[PDB]
């Protein structure tokens, strides 16, 4: 346990007694605290409903706020201009150190009414998805927000995904229109955007874009369609900078995020936009314990949720400071992160286990020449973190004087649901510690049995909240059956965890067939699908094995077709088809060459004997039995 110290208690928004007291009335009565609680916003009409859920068997249905009307981007930035019109929105710091911007909200907002124009001049309109495939420049977020603006559903892709991994994220969402860039720049080296996009969109199947837009942000030769291919200065240049906010309903579609899952290829976790707004702002300002004028700096990308929740929709509905990172925190050297912290007086920093652990291997090479003293709080996302990454954080980074919030949550969450919260709560090492305000976290046995106690089992949620996903794209039925069908009533994260005597959680990890690489989450089924599409491959199966900064590593038992032969320019040939199939986030550690998957009755593969192989382990019976010593001397090379 670590005591909050007097700095933070002096300051916090929230003391011990008020997180009881809050938290205690968030259960019993979330109408009063909901209501309340989501003045953090400006509606357009006020809503009279809170609270009307139901995790049903067959009947899952999700309404926060349900009669009431709103604009995300007038919350982000309309309303914070009559008197912080010149406070910085975004503090964008480039690769190359020697790149920055300080942006307004006055020009932020100014740009995204430019953009919202041209959105709507290009035909885009209320419901249409834009497929969002950019690096960390702040024209994404500009992209963003206009979308939100309109009341379009934009649909953020990770820059990292493969051409083909883009065309199915437009296949399945049918978007209108690409916006992307000619090249992303990250640690010194060019990223091939707009020429990924030109090959997603060769893809027979892609039928509904119109038109790509395309940042000039490097000025790289590529390919260009005409009319179908629209440079991003052309078309903001000409765009009016007067909008109206039109008012959006609360359970109004405001983005989806393709998510890897258990089964098949990943789907599009859909938000609507009260709920999920409130429920973002509410956890930063508390959760962060964000105070006017505080620096603060998220380092995920804009492609996921952390980036859409904490980057940049939560940060923004506060009023905050917001800083985008164009590179990595190790380059050119380790003392980067820092001293991109030091330049930009960061006061607040919410980063990743990887990236920390990653830092951690270089020792004082990743403080050394550097200050630290703005820095006030902290924060782990994304992973579990063990105590001794965890302690290395808290003692180099925050200088044994910020408290570390490790945040648990998910896509389908929105936003924060166990966390500490800095001076509320007392600090262990590598735990969530308690839940937030509206959450109700539950242990169940594989049966549905609720654990009591200090305990452990699957991690359920056995009511809504604000913030929750409201479906998957186009697809409602896999909705229900994914989350609310294991454990009736309801929500199975698919985690597994621990409740010690505190009643603080210590989440173990995925208990489905979904991977954590890099704090990155990435479904077994879909990378070998994605093996198996391979000419010379017959079948797959896929494990994580532990990896010393990465977390998990991707460890492939690959069955060729009869005939072939293993060879090292097989070896490369199939991690750079996996690389092309989905994308460098998913290429195999390892590739075990074998004719011994091990087997039942009926072809269902034993995956837990497979897990402690590839671990390196030497402690049931199949269908023969010969093949689990094959794969132990196969595991010796
Ligand atoms: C530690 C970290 C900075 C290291 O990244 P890295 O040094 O670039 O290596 P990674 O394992 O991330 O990725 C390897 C490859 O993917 C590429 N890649 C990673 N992010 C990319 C992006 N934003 N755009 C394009 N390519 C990217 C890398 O450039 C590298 O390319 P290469 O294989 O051709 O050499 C990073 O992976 C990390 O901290 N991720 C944490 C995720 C997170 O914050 N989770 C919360 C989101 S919900
Ligand atoms: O891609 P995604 O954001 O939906 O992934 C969520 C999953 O990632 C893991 N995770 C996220 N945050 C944590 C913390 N703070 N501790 C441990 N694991 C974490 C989970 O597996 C989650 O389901």
């Known amino acids: 346990k670590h005591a909050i110290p007097a700095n933070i208690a002096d300051r916090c928004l929230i003391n011990p007694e008020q997180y009881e007291t809050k938290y205690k009335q968030s259960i019993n009565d979330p109408d009063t605290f909901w209501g309340e609680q989501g003045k953090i916003l400006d509606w357009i009409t006020p809503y009279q409903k809170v609270k009307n859920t139901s995790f049903a068997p067959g009947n899952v249905s999700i309404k ?151 940042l000039k942000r490097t000025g790289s030769d590529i390919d260009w369609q005409e009319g179908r291919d629209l440079w991003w200065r052309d078309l903001i240049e000409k765009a009016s900078p007067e909008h109206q906010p039109e008012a959006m309903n609360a359970e109004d579609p405001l983005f989806i995020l393709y998510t890897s899952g258990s089964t098949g290829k990943p789907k599009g976790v859909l938000h609507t936009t009260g709920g999920y707004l409130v429920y973002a702002a509410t956890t930063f300002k508390y959760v962060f314990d964000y105070h006017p004028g505080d620096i603060y700096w998220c380092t995920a990308d804009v492609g996921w949720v952390t980036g859409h929740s904490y980057l940049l929709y939560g940060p923004l509905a506060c009023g905050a400071t917001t800083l985008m990172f164009e590179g990595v925190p190790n380059w050119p050297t380790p003392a980067r992160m820092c001293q991109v912290v030091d330049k930009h007086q960061v006061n607040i920093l919410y980063t990743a286990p990887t990236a920390i652990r990653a830092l951690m291997a270089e020792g004082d090479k990743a403080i ?150 890099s704090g990155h989450r990435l479904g077994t089924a879909e990378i070998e699908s994605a093996l198996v599409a391979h000419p010379k491959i017959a079948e797959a199966a896929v494990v994580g094995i532990p990896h010393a900064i990465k977390g998990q590593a991707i460890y492939a038992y690959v069955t060729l077709n009869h005939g072939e032969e293993p060879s090292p320019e097989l070896y490369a040939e199939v991690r750079n088809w996996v690389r092309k199939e989905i994308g460098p986030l998913a290429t195999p550690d390892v590739l075990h060459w074998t004719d011994s998957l091990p087997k039942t009755r009926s072809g269902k593969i034993m995956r837990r004997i497979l897990r402690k192989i590839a671990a390196g382990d030497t402690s049931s019976t199949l269908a023969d039995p010969g093949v689990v010593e094959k794969l132990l001397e196969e595991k010796q090379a």
């Open 64 to 214: 926060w706020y349900e009669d009431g009307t709103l604009n995300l981007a007038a919350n982000c930035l309309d309303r914070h201009l009559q008197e912080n019109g010149d406070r910085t929105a975004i503090i964008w710091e480039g690769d190359d150190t020697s790149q920055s911007k300080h942006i307004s909200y006055r020009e932020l907002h100014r740009d995204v009414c430019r953009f919202a124009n041209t959105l709507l001049d290009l035909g885009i309109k209320k419901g249409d998805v834009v497929a969002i495939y950019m690096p960390m420049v702040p024209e994404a977020a500009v992209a963003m927000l206009a979308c939100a603006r309109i009341g379009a559903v934009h649909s953020v892709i990770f820059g990292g995904f493969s051409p083909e991994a883009v065309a199915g994220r437009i296949i399945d969402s049918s978007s209108r229109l690409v916006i992307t860039a000619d090249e992303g720049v990250r640690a010194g080296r060019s990223i091939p955007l707009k020429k990924n996009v030109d090959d997603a969109l060769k893809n027979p199947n892609v039928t509904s874009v119109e038109h790509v837009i395309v």
């Open 368 to 517: 050394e020449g550097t200050d630290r003293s703005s820095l006030r709080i902290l924060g782990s996302v994304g992973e579990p973190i063990n105590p001794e990454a965890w302690e290395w954080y808290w003692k180099k980074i925050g200088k044994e004087k910020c408290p570390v919030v490790d945040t648990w949550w998910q896509t389908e969450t929105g936003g924060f649901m166990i966390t500490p919260l800095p001076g509320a709560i007392e600090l262990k090492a590598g735990s969530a510690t308690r839940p937030f305000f509206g959450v109700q976290p539950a242990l169940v046995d594989n049966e549905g049995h609720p654990q009591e106690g200090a305990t452990e089992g699957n991690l359920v949620i056995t009511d809504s909240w604000p913030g929750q996903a409201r479906t998957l794209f186009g697809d409602h039925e896999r909705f229900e059956q994914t989350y609310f069908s294991t454990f009736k009533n309801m929500y199975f994260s698919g985690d597994g965890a621990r409740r010690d005597e505190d009643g603080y959680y210590w989440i173990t990890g995925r208990v489905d067939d979904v991977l954590n690489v």
